[PDB]
Amino acid sequence: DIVADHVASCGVNLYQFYGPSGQYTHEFDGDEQFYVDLERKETAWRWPEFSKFGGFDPQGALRNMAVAKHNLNIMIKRYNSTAATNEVPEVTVFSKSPVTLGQPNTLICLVDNIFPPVVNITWLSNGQSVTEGVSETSFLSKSDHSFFKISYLTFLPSADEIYDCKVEHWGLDQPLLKHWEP
Amino acid sequence: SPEDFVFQFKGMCYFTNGTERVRLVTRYIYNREEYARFDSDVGVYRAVTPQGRPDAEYWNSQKEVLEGTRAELDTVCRHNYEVAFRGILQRRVEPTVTISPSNLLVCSVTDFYPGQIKVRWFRNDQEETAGVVSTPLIRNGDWTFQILVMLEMTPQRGDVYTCHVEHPSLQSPITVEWRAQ
């Protein structure tokens, strides 16, 4: 491991056969500064506060993704079609801050050790699917080249509340359901 | 399960002592194995595994590619630091400190940035060293961290507990007191 005061990825370029699909982001000290949405072709910020630190011409990401596509095809052949290994993801659920009845909060579902970078993370309120107030990070990089992804659920703490984070990944025998322990 | 093949390219910048010491390492990865790399401390592309040899030789033979990559140490790493990182490094989010019993007493230090922090427990103004257990630093993903520090309580309901927190965003340490009802 390289020792340094700070580390950034400018940027993380991911491209995979399944889909196929890619991802483009810049990270600083482990957090996502911005990303390029390859579908709408726009540089975007999951946290608008960081837009003041600089924009980005999305064409740079689009060009890199085209090169990444070319490289992947070539590497698949060089590696005799060795497929990715489905690793077992690790899931933890916790709140952003101390929970107080009636005071808005956020539940956080961390899915670590992800590979390949394909996963479905959903939220269940007393067993039923919930989509309102849900958002997530991009696949964030790790030095061992696997990824981690975090999903968020904004909610109003209430009596009798029941929450679970459901994770689907090929590395799991069956979907993983993680109950939030308040 | 569907088969998948993954390519990852990471243009990594390492900084130490401001921008006095900077190192660029671009990594080419197939699935989870890095096969080729450009290290600015080396100056040329190197094959990390046999599968990267074709590229290392090809890229080093292309003047525009090699010179362009060598220049990225400055054009990417150092200039990104000037335009964005210096400012991000000035970001300060003050932690919120809350105490509650779970015997264990838990001091929850939440929503702070950067990640450097110091949390200490005090009992009747006496710093506690034993009976203290802390969770690792927790990355929330939204540019804030949190950390929990537990303390083994004494049988005396009269003892006053204080969670002392030091952080770069604070001119003065935050201290929160707790005493049984």
Binding site: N13, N80 | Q51, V83
Partner: peptide, 20 residues
């Protein structure tokens, strides 16, 4: 101000191996 970024190098065609 648009931020700079590293460019992914274009792989050499043909370098051994065979699709399976």
């Amino acid at each position: 101000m648009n931020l700079p970024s590293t460019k992914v190098s274009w792989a050499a065609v043909g370098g051994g191996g065979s699709l399976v």
